[PDB]
Symmetry: C3
Subunit: 320 residues, 3 copies
């Protein structure tokens, strides 16, 4: 719930004797304004979740989600835009859950500490693929008392090469190889009983990229505060450092949040944002919002386009 931009659970269309199917997703209208110029960023999601009990401590699972968009640019055009965001199957029970296929890595729940806005935020906490969301990957999650644990491992992708090792078509190949894109990620979160305090940390590595994250949060009644720190290498000796702060509170159905994000890549500031929004929940599956991002990049460095502020206006319906 606090991660406002994230998916909500869908609803049952059939069920019987331990086995069910839920359909979910959203229709979200989004208008973006930059320098008084408008862009349509609306999006639809559809998803399907199947779950089958094997016994009282064992079950199977299957999941798909797709995203659909348009880009007319002034004509009634044909729009062939599709993104298969999740494709996996898995097994779970007392020991937790394990899946294969495109699914989330371990660091998402860490970045969730400060990723609480409806449209903006989450600009200074980059995640590498194995830590984020990618296929050819085994993914695990589990909960033991007040400790939550996630982990993932990704295989390098098979390819085909000629005698010298250049990537080529499979018909013209001398042998199989791989792209060296194997990797792993790991994260842990401890909840201190009640009192509202959470702490979390994580690490990830893939090819010549690596990173770690530290985070903490306090939640009390209608108030919330959190902080997050990210540090690693994107390649070479290229350093990345990110800071995020977030605060939010609720008044009736209205939720209000603000974040500060600051990122540094190769010893220059690549992101510097203060953003604010307001979201009104008419119903659990119907909401409206408005958001503004103050861009603090220079404009002598960087440039005019990349230093522009942004206004966003949204209307979101959820299927469930």
């Amino acid at each position: 719930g606090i991660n406002q931009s994230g998916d909500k659970a869908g609803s049952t269309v059939y069920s019987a004797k331990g086995t069910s199917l839920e359909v979910g997703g959203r229709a979200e209208a989004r208008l973006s304004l930059k320098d008084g110029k408008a862009q349509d960023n609306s999006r639809v999601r559809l998803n399907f979740l199947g779950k089958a009990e094997i016994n009282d401590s064992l079950y199977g699972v299957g999941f798909y989600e797709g995203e659909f968009t348009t880009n007319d640019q002034g004509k009634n055009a044909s729009n062939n835009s599709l993104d298969n965001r999740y494709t996996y199957a898995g097994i779970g029970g007392t020991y937790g859950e394990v899946t294969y296929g495109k699914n989330d890595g371990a660091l998402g729940v860490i970045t969730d500490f400060t990723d609480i806005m409806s449209y903006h935020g989450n600009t200074a906490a980059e995640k590498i693929a194995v830590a984020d969301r990618v296929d050819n990957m085994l993914a695990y999650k589990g909960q033991f008392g007040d400790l939550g644990v996630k982990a993932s491992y990704r295989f390098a992708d098979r390819n085909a090469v000629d005698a010298m090792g250049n990537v080529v078509t499979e018909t013209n190949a001398a042998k199989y190889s791989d792209n060296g894109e194997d990797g792993y990620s790991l994260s842990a979160i401890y909840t201190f009983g009640d009192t509202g305090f959470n702490v979390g940390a994580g690490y990830a590595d893939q090819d010549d990229q690596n990173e770690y994250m530290l985070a903490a949060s306090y939640r009390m009644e209608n108030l919330y505060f959190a902080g997050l720190f990210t540090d690693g290498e994107l390649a070479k000796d290229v350093d990345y450092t990110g800071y995020e702060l977030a605060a939010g509170y609720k008044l009736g159905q209205a939720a209000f949040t603000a974040t500060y994000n600051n990122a540094e890549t190769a010893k220059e500031t690549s992101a510097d944002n203060f953003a604010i929004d307001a979201t009104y929940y008419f119903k659990p599956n119907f909401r409206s919002y408005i958001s503004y991002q103050f861009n603090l990049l220079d404009s002598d460095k960087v440039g005019k386009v990349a230093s522009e502020d942004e206004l966003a206006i949204g209307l979101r319906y959820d299927f469930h």
Copy 2:
């Protein structure tokens, strides 16, 4: 309903006190014959409608529709043909309904006066984008007594330009601009009590394009008559003028219709069609039909291909 080619409403997959989800669409097999040569024009549609009541005079809505086709050309090929026809969210109530995202403009309900065939017709009533269906657009509709009103406004699309004003990548851009494709549309329909007589009119404008339409219809017992006139400019001094006539009758099940369509572009005849069909309704969601279009373009002007007649045969199943 009289507009036979249009969508029918889908059916509920879950509900729970003012909130529902409906799934709909069609599987429509269509064979096209020209000069004794056959083409498969079959199509599938799937759509999802969510609706949530906020109160006795207020609700929210979200909608998506996609269309799916194949084009094998003699091989068992992979077919990645998708069209996202609708993507919008909106709010409605006592005063009517307003939406944002790709949805219909105002002139469709006007062209519906003569658009009554299962396959042919609707060839001499061109609609510009704001009047037809397009994104980055606010759309409104309402009904008050015997008066129906529709309206829409579309924003110009943001783009990025270099110092010289050339459209370029955002990374290579000196500033933001737009494509000048803003516009609007408006239409009204009046019903003369219970007399079966209807009149309608509309207007639309976008960049160097504009148009207006006038229409009238009469319905009595098992008979229907209608006329439609379209006039405007597609650009420069490129004039467009369109005339359509339609008549139909019903006998038990199976419906019979005929239309005449005639269009003139740049002071030359660009469309000239007389068409007849028969459609048999086995069930409300299962029908068959057959249609023939007499092409009356010359062949000395125009050409042999563009002056050919067409036979069409269809079988349509609707999901509900």
Copy 3:
């Protein structure tokens, strides 16, 4: 059931008085290992089946199925991969069922004699388009006692040619023609009473391609054996010949299969496979499996890549 890799029936989401809609499909995680190198071959399917009774011996039908995949190659990429596998509508009753749109030809049920593995097999029984699955085709099937009959006919696809006879765009064309890809297929299967013996055979022809198939099987309690032979022409005078053997055994919740596959194209061996697998059914709609294919091609001929063994590991959830 015996054709393990094939679809299972979906489940009802709504129904009323003879008319229903079923949603089905799968989420299937699949890991492929060749030369110690891993490839993600996971896939999702979604399908929608509508059926409406007209009377005690007459009904209508509409069907769609799509397949969805990812190919990240180490990045969190956008994946626009869709395949519309089926798009058809049809009518059926006492005499059987007839459809138009992309659907199956007649020879699939013949290749089903030995196509019983979860992942491998079915490598030496090539089917031409009209016999396989393709659009612009009328398809018929029926069952009368122990006789199953299937047939199909496909039209050539309309195209457009210039004065010189070259395929060109419709605006630049002198006339309509076609690609000469018309054809037909035919097949039959008899069950020899309650003896466990089945015999089947089929034939197909399209443009300059043709083929026939012969098959037989014996099924008794928890044992199964079958054989299949394929012979025809792929073009001009270039020959194709295929041989398949299959065996299977069942123990409680557990299936075990093995197949031998051998094909010859243009008087050279193009396929040579011995494969074995094991599949465990936790629930009717949740299973796991592991499979190994011994590749028997030479390696001096053909090459190293095309002669590699393969290990496969799978986890399959079915939507119903």
